[model samples]
Structure formats: C-alpha cells, structure tokens
Target: GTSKLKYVLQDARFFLIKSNNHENVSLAKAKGVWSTLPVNEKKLNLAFRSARSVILIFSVRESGKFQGFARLSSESHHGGSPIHWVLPAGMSAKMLGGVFKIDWICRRELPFTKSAHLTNPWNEHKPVKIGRDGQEIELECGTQLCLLFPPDESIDLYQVIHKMR
Candidate 1:
C-alpha cells in the first residue's frame, strides 16, 4: 500500500585518518581530520528534489555480524526514536519507503544502558518479555536487554525447553 512521505533536514560530518594506526585507537587519538559531509548540499538537494520521501539507515561493523532495524514515517511529525531530531521545515515530504534494517555482530551479554523510556517515563520501569519458543523477545521502547552469550552463540536451548514444558 502507498503511504504519505515527509522530509527532514540534518547535519553530519565525516573524518579521515592521516595515517595507519594500531587497532581500536580512537579517531581523535589517531591523528584524524574532519572532512566535508559525505553527502553535500547539492546531493541532498537532488535527493529532496527527486524523491517523495527519504529514509536514512545506519549500521555498525564489529567482529563480523550485523543486527538492528528501524522505520520512520513521513506523514507524522515525529517518527523513530526521539533522540533523532526530525528534519527542518520548508522541505516537502518525499515519497521514500521508510523501512530500514541493519545487521552487525557484537558481544551478546555485555552490560548495556539506555535512557530511552519504553512505557511510562514517570514510572521509569519496564519488563522484558522472553518468548517460550526462543524465537522472539518483546521489549518496550527505551528498554534494554543484555544477553550472556556472544553473537555467535545461541541462548541456552535448555532454558527454552524448560520454559515451554
């Protein structure tokens, strides 16, 4: 089905390294220099001029796997997470599919913290739902979950079996 589109303006910067550096060195520590935006105003103008809507996708490359998904809508004033500010006005909505998917690998069980609130921000509390079949998990917006296994490892199958039974 067709849907209405919206456009928002955003600013971003790019950086380049001056020379090779040891692993895991910070960009700032590695003698990096900031460069022009990956997408210039002309390119952005062209995108806005050509499309009915625009969708921006982000991904992280770690040891080797990918994981994450988000979607945005143009009709509504706000979409996606609140942390991301919406584009500015004067830019008409363009017809671009807002669906996006990201994939990456990372440590599974490392402690993760987030300030986004899932349910009542005043309450500041939410529950994580783990499916019995081990196929899916439900978490409120702004909620975070920490898994014990690495991305390459699966959650304990025995745990799922016990819960299902």
Candidate 2:
C-alpha cells in the first residue's frame, strides 16, 4: 500500500481512472435498483429535494436480476402499502412525469424473500377479490390507508403486508 500515492497520481484520479474502472464492471446486463437517503436537515441542495426511494436502472452491467413491482394508477397510487415508494424514481403520479432528484445510490445484491405466506390467497389456490375503495386523497396517503375499508373488514392487503413485516 506504500506506493498507493504513486498509483493515485498515475491513474486513481477521477479523470484518469473513471473510464478504465467502467470497463471492469461492464460485465453482465441486469436490472439494478439503487436506494438513496436525503439529509433533510442540510442546506438547500439538489440531493435534499426528493424523498428516499429506489431507482431502477435498466441494462446495468451486473448479475442481479430484479423482479420490479408494477402497478396502475393515475394522479394517485394503489391503495395502501409503500407501493408508491417502491416505484422506480423519476416515475411521478401526475399528468407529467419528471426525473427524480437522488442523494446517493448503491446496488441491491440479494433479497430475503420466501415463496409465499400460508394465509396468502395465491398460495392457497384461491382467487382473491381485487378492488379499490375509491376514496379521494383529501389528506396525506398515510392517513387514509385503512379509512376506506368496509366496517366488516373481510380483506385488507395493507394489513396483510404489515403482518409480514
């Protein structure tokens, strides 16, 4: 490590080694999902502009195949769950989408997911009814998650997800 200083000057500098390192990771093409955390308490900067979420980069030179979540919503999100947060960055719920501001990002190597839960309708070979309560977003999304449910409460996907956590 003694000659590190020599190597730093030789190629480790940003302009000298950036392109060379790029070739090393140009290995396998796979989807890469990266997460970023913004420091809200910091001075005004681009990094602090967006909420924390995952960014799905297409055709990255990596070997981690990702099964991205897909949902249909217009000017709103699927009722309940961090379904909105899980969407790839730059995908906004509005008439027009925009590139999302991010702070820092890293690779998602592996996940700790299982086949399915015992009570999961998909696992039990039963078709679960998928319906929305059609509740207007009068307040923040967090507040109205369960507010639109029927009083009997026969089904709640949000509660099911919370139980898993």
Q: Which number leads on lDDT?
A: 1
Give the distance in Å from residue 70's predicted Cα in candidate 1 to where it truly belongs: 6.2
Residue-wise C-alpha lDDT for candidate 2, range 1-165, written one tens digit per residue: 213212211211010001112222232112211122222112112212222211122111232221211111111212322212332346444422222222111122212122111121222322111111111111122112111212222222342222221
lDDT of 1: 0.22
Q: Give the residue spans of candidate 1 off by over 4 A.
A: 1-41, 63-165
All candidates' lDDT scores? 0.22, 0.20
Off by more than 4 A, model 2: 1-96, 111-165
Q: Kindly list the per-residue Cα lDDT of model 1 for residues 48-85, writing each as its tens digit.
A: 33433222211122312112211122122224432221
Worst-scoring 10-residue span by lDDT in model 1: 1-10
Instruction: State the lDDT at 148 in candidate 2.
Output: 20
